[PDB]
Design a protein around this nucleic acid. Structure first.
Lengths: 215, 228
RNA sequence: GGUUGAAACACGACCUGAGAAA
């Protein structure tokens, strides 16, 4: 029966200057042998707090930690825009060491409408039998957005994928790509390709279009 | 010179199921003999999972149940390097593996104060494939938010990762390189885009520099408005 | 439980306390 670390909340969204707290409960006593880390996606975690309440040398003073029994709290007293990350607690009271499941911290800010761009497939790609059509939504907030593909005014389904950047470290926006994949034969059969974007920054949905082969 | 604490990892990459791999963690700025060294891994979309550790003075070793009997941690103090030898690899072992230094007790308790950069281990029977790179062409007729946009589409590559720069790194403002997406073919694709002044198209050159080390692919692609 | 030896075990020194497997 390994010690479990239960983190809360699963995610939070707070503005610059806000006080944020994250908690972690150990399933049994871990004394004060708890560390907190900050991790950017795909990067090494960084040590913030050790022995429950001690600030690691060099870490900014807005971070602090505290213990009450088996409940551990990480506090950020005044959130900064680079503080978006997943934060993890860890117990090293006994082997095996165990980690909490992470709390994702997002920087809340004002609404920003996306700028929208559509890209036809290149002639070079078509020669290999597949066509990729790309829609870009640039520098928007919040993250939620709908992208609808229309081919000759017919709504598309099941043939696109989306990817999103992490938040901008300066102004907290996202960008998003939507890629529509068609066979060359299907691409050549139709004329008008359109990307329709709905987002709370836009009063009305924005559609970008091109005509195949028409410059 | 200033002596910096550094952990430099190597040895990761693509390995067939049932195969073996040895990861290395070469340390500088401190003598590994006097620290506990740990391995921690992170599977795609999952959290941190502690894997193994080795103790100073004794060389005692410890393992997570998930790897016990298959993985071996060790340290060669004469090379200031720690190792994770991994046998009988399964798909569930696919992850970024990190080595970490447990800090000095009086200054950091048991916290892990320095970490390696991570190395990706991919357990799969699939073959390495280099990407194709296609232009995302811009236009002075296609402006939004006061800019034009252009980019490069990097497609059908395996395993991760690829990296993209623009104009050999001289162009960074407005660049967005999206996370890779796994296609139904089992190959990855991503795009990298940049917003630029519409007045600049035709006065300025935009080249995307694509790197896929697993295949030794280095590709530069000029992105220009089409003559139309 | 805490301090401390570059130190969770092994190899050492301590503090609190009836006892640090408390």
């Amino acid at each position: 029966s390994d010690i479990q670390m239960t983190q809360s909340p699963s995610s939070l969204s707070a503005s610059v200057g806000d006080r944020v707290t994250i908690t972690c409960r150990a399933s049994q006593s871990v004394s004060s042998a708890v560390a907190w880390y900050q991790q950017k996606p795909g990067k090494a975690p960084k040590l913030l707090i050790y022995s429950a309440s001690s600030l690691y040398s060099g870490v900014p003073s807005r971070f602090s930690g505290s213990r009450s029994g088996t409940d551990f709290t990480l506090t950020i007293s005044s959130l900064q825009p680079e503080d978006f990350a997943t934060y993890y607690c860890q117990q090293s009271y006994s082997f095996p060491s165990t980690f909490g499941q992470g709390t994702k911290v997002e920087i809340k800010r004002t609404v920003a409408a996306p700028s929208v761009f559509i890209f036809p497939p290149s002639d070079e790609q078509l020669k290999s039998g597949t066509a990729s059509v790309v829609c870009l939504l640039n520098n928007f907030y919040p993250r939620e957005a709908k992208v609808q593909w229309k081919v000759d005014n017919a709504l598309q389904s099941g043939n696109s994928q989306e990817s999103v950047t992490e938040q901008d470290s300066k102004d907290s926006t996202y960008s998003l790509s939507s890629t529509l994949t068609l066979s060359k034969a299907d691409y050549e059969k139709h004329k008008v390709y359109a990307c329709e974007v709905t987002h709370q920054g836009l009063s009305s949905p924005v559609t970008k279009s091109f005509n195949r082969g028409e410059c | 010179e200033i002596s910096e604490v550094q952990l430099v990892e190597s040895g990761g990459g693509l390995v067939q199921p049932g195969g073996s791999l040895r990861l290395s963690c070469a340390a500088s700025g401190f003598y590994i003999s006097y620290s506990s060294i740990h391995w921690v891994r992170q599977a795609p979309g999952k959290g941190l999972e502690w894997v193994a550790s080795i103790s100073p003075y004794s060389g005692s070793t410890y393992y997570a149940d998930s790897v016990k009997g298959r993985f071996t941690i060790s340290a060669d103090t004469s090379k200031n390097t720690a190792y994770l030898q991994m046998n009988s690899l399964r798909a569930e072992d696919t992850a970024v593996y990190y080595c970490a230094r447990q800090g000095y007790r009086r200054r950091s308790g048991r916290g892990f104060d320095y970490w390696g950069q991570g190395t990706l281990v991919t357990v799969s029977s699939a073959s390495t494939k280099g990407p194709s790179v296609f232009p995302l062409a811009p236009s002075s007729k296609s402006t939004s938010g006061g800019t034009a946009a252009l980019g490069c589409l990097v497609k059908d590559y395996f395993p991760e990762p690829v990296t993209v720069s623009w104009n050999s790194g001289a162009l960074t403002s407005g660049v967005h390189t999206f996370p890779a997406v796994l296609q139904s073919s089992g190959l990855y694709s991503l795009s990298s885009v940049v917003t630029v002044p519409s007045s600049s198209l035709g006065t300025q050159t935009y080249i995307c520099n694509v790197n896929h080390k697993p295949s030794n692919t280095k590709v530069d692609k000029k992105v220009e408005p089409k003559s139309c």
